[PDB]
PDB file of C-alpha atoms and ligand atoms in Angstrom:
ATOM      1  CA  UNK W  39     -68.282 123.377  89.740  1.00 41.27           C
ATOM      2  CA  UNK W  40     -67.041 126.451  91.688  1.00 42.08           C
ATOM      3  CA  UNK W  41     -66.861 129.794  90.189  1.00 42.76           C
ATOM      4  CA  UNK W  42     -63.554 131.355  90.384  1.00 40.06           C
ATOM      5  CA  UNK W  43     -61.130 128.267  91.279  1.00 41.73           C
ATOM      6  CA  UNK W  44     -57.416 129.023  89.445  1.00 45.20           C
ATOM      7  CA  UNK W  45     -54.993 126.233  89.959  1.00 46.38           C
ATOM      8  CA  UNK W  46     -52.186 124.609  87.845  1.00 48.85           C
ATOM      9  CA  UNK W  47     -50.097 121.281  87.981  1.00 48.43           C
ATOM     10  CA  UNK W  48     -47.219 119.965  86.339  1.00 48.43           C
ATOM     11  CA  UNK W  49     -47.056 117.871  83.305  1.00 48.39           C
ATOM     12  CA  UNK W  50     -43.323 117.597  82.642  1.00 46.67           C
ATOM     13  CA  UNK W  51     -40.245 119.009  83.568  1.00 45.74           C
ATOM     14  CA  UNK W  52     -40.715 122.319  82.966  1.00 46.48           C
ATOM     15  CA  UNK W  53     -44.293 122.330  81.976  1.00 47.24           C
ATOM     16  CA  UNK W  54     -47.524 123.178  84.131  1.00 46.80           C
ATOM     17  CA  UNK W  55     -51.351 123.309  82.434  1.00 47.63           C
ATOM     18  CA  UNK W  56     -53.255 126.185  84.318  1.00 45.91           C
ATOM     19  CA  UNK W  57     -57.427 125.251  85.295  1.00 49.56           C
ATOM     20  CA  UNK W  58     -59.736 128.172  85.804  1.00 51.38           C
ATOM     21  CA  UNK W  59     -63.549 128.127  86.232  1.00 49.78           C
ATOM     22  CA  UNK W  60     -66.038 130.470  84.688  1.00 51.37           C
ATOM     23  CA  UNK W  61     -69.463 131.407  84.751  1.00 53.99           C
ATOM     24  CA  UNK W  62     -70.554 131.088  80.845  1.00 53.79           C
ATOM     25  CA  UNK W  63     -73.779 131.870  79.331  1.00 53.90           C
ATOM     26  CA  UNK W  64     -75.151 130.977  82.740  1.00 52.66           C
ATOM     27  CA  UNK W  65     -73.295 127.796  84.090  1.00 55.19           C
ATOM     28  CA  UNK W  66     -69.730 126.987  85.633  1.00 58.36           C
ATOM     29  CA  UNK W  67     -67.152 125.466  82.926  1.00 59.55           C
ATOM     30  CA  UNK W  68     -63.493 124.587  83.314  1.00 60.87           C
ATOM     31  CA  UNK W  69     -60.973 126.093  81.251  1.00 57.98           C
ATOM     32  CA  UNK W  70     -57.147 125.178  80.385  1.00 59.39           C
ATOM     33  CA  UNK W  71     -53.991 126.774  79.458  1.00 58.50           C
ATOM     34  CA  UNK W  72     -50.228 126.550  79.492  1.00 60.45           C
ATOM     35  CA  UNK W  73     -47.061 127.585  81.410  1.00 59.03           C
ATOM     36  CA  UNK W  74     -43.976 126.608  79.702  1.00 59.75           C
ATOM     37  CA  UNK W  75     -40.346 127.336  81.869  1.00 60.91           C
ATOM     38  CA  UNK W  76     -38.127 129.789  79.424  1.00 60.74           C
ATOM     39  CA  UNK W  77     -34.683 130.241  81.301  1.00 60.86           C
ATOM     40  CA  UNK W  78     -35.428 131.941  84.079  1.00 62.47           C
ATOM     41  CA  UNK W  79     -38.469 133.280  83.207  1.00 63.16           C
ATOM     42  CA  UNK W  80     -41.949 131.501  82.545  1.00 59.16           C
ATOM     43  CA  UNK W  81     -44.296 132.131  78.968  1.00 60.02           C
ATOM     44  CA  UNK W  82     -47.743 132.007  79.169  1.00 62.07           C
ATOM     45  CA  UNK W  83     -50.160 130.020  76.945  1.00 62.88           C
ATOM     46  CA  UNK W  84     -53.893 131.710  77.523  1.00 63.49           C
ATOM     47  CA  UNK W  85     -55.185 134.123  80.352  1.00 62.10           C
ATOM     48  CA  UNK W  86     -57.408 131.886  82.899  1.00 62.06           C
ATOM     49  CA  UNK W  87     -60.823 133.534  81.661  1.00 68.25           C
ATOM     50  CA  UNK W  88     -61.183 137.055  83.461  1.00 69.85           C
ATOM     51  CA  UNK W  89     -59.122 139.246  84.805  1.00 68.12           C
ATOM     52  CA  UNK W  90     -59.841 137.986  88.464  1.00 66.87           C
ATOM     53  CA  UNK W  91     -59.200 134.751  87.335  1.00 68.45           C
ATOM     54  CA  UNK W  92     -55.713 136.177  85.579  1.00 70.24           C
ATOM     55  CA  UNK W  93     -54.952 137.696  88.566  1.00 70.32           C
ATOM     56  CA  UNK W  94     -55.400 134.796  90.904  1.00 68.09           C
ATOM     57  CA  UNK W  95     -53.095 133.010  88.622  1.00 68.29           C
ATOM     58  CA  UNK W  96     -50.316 135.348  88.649  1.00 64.30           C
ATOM     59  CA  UNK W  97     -50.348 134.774  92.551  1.00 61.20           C
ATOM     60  CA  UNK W  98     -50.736 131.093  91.964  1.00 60.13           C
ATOM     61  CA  UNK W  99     -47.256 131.399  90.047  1.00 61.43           C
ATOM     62  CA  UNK W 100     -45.879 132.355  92.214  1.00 63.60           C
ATOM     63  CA  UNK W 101     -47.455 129.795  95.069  1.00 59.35           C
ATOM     64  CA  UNK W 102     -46.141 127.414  93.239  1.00 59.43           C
ATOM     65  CA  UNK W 103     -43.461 127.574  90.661  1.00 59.59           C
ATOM     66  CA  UNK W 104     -42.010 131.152  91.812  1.00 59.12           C
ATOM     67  CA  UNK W 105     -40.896 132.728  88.279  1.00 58.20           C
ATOM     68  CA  UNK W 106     -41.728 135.455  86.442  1.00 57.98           C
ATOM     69  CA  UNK W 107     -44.634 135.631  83.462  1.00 59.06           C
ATOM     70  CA  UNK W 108     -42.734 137.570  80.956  1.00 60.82           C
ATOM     71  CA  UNK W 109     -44.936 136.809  77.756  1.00 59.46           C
ATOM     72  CA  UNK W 110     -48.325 135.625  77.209  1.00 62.66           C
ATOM     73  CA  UNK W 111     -49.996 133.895  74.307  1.00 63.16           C
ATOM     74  CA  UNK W 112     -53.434 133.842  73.244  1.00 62.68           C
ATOM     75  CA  UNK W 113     -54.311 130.713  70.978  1.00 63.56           C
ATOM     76  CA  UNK W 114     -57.826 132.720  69.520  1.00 65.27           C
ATOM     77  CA  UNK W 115     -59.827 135.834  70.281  1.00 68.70           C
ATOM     78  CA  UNK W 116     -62.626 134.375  72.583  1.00 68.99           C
ATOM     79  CA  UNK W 117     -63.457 135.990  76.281  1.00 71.59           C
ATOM     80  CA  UNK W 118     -61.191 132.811  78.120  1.00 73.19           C
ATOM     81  CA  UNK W 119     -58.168 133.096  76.229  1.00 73.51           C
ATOM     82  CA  UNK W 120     -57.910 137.012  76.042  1.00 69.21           C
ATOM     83  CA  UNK W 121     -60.065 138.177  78.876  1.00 65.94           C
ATOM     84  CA  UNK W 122     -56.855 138.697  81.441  1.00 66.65           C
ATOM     85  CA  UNK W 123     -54.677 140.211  79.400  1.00 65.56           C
ATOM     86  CA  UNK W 124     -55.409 143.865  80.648  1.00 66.05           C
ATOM     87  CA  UNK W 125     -54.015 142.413  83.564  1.00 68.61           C
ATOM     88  CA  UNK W 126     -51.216 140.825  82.164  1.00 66.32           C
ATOM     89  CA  UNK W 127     -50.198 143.665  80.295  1.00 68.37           C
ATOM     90  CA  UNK W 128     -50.433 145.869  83.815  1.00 68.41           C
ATOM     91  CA  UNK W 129     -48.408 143.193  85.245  1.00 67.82           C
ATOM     92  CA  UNK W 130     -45.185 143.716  82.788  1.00 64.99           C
ATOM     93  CA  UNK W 131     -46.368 140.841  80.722  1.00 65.30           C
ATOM     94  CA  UNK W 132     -45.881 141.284  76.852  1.00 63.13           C
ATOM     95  CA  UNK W 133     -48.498 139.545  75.622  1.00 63.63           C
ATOM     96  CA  UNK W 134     -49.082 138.191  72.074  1.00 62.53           C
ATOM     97  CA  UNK W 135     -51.480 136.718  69.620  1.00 61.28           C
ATOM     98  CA  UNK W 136     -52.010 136.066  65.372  1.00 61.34           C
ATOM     99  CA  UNK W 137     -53.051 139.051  63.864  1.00 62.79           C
ATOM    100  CA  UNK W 138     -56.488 138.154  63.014  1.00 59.10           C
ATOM    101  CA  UNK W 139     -57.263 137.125  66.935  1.00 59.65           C
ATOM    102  CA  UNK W 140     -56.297 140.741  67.371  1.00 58.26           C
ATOM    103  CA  UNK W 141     -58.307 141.747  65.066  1.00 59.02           C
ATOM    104  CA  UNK W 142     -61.464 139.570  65.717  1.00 59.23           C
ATOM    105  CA  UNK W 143     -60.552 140.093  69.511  1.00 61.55           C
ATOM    106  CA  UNK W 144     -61.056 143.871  68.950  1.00 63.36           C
ATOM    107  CA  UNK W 145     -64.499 143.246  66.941  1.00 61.29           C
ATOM    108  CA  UNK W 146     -65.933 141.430  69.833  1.00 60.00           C
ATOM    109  CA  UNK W 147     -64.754 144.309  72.647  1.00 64.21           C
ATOM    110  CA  UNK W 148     -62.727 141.378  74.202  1.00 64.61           C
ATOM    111  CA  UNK W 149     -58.965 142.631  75.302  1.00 66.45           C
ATOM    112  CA  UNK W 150     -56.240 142.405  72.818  1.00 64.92           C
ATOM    113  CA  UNK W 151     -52.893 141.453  72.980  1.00 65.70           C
ATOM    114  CA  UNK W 152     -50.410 143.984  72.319  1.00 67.77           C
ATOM    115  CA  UNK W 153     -48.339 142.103  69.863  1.00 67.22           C
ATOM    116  CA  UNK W 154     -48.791 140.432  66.493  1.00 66.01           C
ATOM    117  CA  UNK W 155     -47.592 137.099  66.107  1.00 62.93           C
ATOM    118  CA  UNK W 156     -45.626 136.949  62.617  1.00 62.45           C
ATOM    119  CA  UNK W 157     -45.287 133.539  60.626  1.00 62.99           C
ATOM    120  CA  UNK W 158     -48.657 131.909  61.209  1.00 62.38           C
ATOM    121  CA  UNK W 159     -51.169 133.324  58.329  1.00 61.16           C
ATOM    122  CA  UNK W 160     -51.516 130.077  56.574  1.00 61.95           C
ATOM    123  CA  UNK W 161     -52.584 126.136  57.071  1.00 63.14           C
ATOM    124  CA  UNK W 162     -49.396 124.372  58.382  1.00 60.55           C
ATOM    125  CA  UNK W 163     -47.630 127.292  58.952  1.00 62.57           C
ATOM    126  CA  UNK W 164     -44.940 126.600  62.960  1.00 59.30           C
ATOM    127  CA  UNK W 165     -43.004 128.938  64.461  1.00 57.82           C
ATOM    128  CA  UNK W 166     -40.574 129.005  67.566  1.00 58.04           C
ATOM    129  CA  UNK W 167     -41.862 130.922  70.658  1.00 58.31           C
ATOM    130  CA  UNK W 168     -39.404 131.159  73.164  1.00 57.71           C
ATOM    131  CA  UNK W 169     -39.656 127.464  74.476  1.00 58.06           C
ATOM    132  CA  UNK W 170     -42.603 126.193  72.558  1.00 54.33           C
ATOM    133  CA  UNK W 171     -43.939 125.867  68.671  1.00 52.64           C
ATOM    134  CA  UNK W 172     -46.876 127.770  67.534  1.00 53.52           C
ATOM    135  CA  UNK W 173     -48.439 125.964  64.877  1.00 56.73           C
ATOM    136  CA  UNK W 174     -51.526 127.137  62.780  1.00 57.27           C
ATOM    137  CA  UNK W 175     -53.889 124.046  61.932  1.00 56.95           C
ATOM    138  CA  UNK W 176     -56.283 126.113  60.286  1.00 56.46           C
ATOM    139  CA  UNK W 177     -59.939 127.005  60.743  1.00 56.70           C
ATOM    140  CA  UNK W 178     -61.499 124.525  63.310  1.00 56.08           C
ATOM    141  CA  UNK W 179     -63.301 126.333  66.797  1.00 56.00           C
ATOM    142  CA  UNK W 180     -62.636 129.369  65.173  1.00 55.41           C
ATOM    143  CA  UNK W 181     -61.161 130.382  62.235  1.00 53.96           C
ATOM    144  CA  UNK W 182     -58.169 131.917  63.984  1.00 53.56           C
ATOM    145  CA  UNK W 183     -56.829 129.229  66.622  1.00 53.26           C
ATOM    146  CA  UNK W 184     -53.778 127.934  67.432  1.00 54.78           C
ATOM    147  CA  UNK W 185     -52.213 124.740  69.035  1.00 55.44           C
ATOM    148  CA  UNK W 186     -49.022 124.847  70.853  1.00 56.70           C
ATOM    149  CA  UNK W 187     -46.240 122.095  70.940  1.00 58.46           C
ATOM    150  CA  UNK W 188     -43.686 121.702  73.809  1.00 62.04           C
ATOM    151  CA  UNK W 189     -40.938 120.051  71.956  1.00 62.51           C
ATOM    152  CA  UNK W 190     -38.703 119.559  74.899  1.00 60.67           C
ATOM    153  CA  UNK W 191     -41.501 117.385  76.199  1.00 60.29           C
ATOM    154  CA  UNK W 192     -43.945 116.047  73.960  1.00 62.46           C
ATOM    155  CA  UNK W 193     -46.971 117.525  74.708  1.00 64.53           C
ATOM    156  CA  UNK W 194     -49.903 118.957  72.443  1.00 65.22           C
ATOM    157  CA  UNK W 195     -51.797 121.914  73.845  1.00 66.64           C
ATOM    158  CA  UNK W 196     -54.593 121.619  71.152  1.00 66.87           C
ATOM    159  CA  UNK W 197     -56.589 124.533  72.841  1.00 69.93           C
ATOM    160  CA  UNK W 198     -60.581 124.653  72.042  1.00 69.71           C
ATOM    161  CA  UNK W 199     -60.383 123.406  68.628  1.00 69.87           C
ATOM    162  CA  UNK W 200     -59.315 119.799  70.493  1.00 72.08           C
ATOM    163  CA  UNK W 201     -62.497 118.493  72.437  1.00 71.31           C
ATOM    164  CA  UNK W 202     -62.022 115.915  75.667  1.00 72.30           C
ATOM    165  CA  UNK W 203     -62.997 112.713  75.380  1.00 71.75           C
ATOM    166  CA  UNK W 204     -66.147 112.747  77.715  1.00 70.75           C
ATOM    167  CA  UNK W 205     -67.886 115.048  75.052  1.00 71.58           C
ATOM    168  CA  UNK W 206     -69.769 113.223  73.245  1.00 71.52           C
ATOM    169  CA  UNK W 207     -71.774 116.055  70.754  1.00 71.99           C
ATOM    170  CA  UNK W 208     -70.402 119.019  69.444  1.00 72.75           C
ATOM    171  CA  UNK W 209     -70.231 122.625  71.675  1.00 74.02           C
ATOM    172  CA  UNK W 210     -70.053 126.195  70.875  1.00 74.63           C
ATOM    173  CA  UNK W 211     -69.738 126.367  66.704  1.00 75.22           C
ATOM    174  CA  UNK W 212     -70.844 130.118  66.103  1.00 72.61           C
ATOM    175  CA  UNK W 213     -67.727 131.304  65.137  1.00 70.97           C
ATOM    176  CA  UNK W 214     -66.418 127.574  63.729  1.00 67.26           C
ATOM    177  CA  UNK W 215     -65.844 125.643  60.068  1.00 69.70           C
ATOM    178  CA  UNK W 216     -67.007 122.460  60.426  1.00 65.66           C
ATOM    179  CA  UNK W 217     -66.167 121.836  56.620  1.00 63.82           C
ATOM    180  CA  UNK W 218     -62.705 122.412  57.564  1.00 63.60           C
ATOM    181  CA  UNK W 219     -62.397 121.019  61.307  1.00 65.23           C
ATOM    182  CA  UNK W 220     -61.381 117.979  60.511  1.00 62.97           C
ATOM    183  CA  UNK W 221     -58.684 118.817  57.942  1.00 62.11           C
ATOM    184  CA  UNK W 222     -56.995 120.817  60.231  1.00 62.88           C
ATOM    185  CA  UNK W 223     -56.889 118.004  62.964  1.00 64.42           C
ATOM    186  CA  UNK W 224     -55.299 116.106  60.195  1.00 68.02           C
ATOM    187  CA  UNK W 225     -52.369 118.776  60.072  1.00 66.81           C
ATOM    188  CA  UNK W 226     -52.041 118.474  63.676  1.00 67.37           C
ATOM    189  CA  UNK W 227     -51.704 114.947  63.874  1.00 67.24           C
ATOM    190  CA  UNK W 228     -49.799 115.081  60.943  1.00 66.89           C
ATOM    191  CA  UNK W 229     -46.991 117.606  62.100  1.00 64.84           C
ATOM    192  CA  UNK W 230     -46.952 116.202  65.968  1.00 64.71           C
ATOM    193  CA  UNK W 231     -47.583 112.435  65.703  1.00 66.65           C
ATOM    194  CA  UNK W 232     -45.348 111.532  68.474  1.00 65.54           C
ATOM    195  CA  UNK W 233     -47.130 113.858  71.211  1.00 64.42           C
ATOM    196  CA  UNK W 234     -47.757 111.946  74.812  1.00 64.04           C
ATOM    197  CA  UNK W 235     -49.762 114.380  76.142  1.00 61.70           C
ATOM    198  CA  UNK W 236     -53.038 116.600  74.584  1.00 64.27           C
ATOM    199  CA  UNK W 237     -54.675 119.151  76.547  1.00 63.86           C
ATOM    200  CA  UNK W 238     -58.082 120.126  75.127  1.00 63.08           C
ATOM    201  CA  UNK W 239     -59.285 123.930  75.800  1.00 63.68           C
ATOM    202  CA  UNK W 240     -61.671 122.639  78.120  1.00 64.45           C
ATOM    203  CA  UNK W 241     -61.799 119.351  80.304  1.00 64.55           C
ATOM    204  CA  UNK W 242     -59.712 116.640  80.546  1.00 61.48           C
ATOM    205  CA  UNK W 243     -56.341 116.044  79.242  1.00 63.48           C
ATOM    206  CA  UNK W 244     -55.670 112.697  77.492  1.00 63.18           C
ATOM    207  CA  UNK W 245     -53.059 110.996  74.589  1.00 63.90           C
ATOM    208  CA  UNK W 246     -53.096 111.531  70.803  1.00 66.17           C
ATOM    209  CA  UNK W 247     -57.042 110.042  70.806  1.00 68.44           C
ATOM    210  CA  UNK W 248     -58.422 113.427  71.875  1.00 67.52           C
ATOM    211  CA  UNK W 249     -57.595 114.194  67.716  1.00 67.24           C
ATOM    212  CA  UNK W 250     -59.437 111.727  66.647  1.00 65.18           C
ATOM    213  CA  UNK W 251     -62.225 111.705  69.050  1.00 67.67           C
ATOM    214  CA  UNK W 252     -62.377 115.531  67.881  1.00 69.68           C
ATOM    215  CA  UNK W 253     -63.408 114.611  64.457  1.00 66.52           C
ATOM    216  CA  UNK W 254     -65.654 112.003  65.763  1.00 63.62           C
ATOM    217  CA  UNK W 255     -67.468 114.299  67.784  1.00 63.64           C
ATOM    218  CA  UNK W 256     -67.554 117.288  64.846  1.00 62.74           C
ATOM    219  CA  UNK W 257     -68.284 115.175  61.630  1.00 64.19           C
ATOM    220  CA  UNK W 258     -71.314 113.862  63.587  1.00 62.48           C
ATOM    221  CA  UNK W 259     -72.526 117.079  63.760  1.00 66.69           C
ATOM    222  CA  UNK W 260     -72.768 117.529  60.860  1.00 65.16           C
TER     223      UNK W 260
HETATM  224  O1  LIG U   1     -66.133 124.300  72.847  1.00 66.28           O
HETATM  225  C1  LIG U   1     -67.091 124.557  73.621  1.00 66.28           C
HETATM  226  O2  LIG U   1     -68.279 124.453  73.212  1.00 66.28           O
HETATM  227  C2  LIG U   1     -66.863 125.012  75.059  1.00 66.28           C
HETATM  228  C3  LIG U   1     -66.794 124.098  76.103  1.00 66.28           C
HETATM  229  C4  LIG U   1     -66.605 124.544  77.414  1.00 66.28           C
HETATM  230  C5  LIG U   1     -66.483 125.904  77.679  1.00 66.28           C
HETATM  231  C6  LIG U   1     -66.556 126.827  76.625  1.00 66.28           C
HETATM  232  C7  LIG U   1     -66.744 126.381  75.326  1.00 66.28           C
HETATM  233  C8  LIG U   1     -66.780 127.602  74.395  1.00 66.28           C
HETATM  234  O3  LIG U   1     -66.928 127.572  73.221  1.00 66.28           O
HETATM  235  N1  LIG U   1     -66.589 128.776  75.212  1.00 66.28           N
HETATM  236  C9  LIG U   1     -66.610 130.142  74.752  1.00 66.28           C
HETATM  237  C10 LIG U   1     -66.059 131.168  75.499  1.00 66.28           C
HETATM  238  C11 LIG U   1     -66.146 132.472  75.035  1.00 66.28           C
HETATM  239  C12 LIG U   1     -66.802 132.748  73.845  1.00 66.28           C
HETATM  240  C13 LIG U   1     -67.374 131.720  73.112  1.00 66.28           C
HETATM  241  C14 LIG U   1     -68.113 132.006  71.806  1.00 66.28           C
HETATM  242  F1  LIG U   1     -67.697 133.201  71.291  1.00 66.28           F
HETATM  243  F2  LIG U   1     -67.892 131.006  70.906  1.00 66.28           F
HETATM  244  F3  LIG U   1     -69.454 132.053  72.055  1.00 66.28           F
HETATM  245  C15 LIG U   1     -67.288 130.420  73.576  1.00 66.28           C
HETATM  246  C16 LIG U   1     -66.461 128.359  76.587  1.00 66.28           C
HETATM  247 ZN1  LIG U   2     -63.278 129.534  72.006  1.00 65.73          ZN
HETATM  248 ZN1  LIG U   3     -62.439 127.901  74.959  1.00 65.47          ZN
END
């Protein structure tokens, strides 16, 4: 893969997934996020790894969809969903994330979002966010993640704790819970079990088996 490459497309009215590429511990890996229309204006699910990368998207926006980023959420603390949001922030962007991803964010000297998300401390726990849901599955990738539901249009942005289905073995799991990985794909295919569309953190989108293939992948860990 390319280093560098920032491009989006659109999954539904309304709805684009962002796809960066990043040099990580040594080799090229793709990386998704969200852009979800609000009004006017656009919200932002995850930075696109880097602030060149971040940057590049901004631009790419505007390439192609030509409205404003006027918040930004991070879905946990690692470098390719907060590393960008220096330049967000520079850019007028209000970006956003749990407390505890600010928090672990600021352990690891990764950039941290200016403002604490309210309403998502425990297991289950959904909030509104402009035009999506915010939903807390509990610890999975990391103890801090978050999915993100488009209601308007059905689609499950499960973020890293949500693997694609050409993974066969489990990834990174320094900072997981593999005891409780699987429990919290069970909320999330509890709380959006008519989603059409899952987007893992990294690789290919699919349907509603990317949950289940998930806890395949994890419990045969392990
Ligand atoms: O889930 C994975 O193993 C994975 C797959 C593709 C790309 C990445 C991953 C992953 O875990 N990444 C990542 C990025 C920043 C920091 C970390 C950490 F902190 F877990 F090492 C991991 C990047
Ligand atoms: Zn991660
Ligand atoms: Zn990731």
């Amino acid at each position: 893969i390319p280093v560098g490459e920032v491009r989006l497309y659109q999954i539904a009215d309304g709805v684009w997934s962002h796809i960066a590429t990043q040099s990580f511990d040594g080799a090229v890996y793709p990386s998704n996020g969200l852009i979800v229309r609000d009004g006017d204006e656009l919200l932002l699910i995850d930075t696109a790894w880097g602030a060149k990368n971040t940057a590049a998207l901004l631009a790419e926006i505007e390439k192609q969809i030509g409205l404003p980023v006027t918040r930004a959420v991070s879905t946990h603390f690692h470098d390719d969903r907060v590393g960008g949001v220096d330049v967000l922030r520079a850019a007028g962007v209000a970006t956003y994330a749990s407390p505890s991803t600010r928090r672990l964010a600021e352990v690891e000297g990764n950039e941290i979002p200016t403002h604490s998300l309210e309403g998502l401390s425990s297991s289950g726990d959904a909030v509104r966010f402009g035009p999506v849901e915010l939903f807390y599955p509990g610890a999975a990738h990391s103890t801090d993640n978050l999915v993100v539901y488009v209601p308007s249009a059905s689609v499950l942005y499960g973020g890293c704790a949500i693997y694609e289905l050409s993974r066969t073995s489990a990834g990174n799991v320094a900072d997981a819970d593999l005891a409780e990985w699987p429990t919290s794909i069970e909320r999330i295919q509890q709380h959006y079990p008519e989603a059409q569309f899952v987007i893992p953190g990294h690789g290919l989108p699919g349907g509603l088996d990317l949950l289940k293939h998930t806890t395949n992948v994890v419990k045969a860990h392990t």
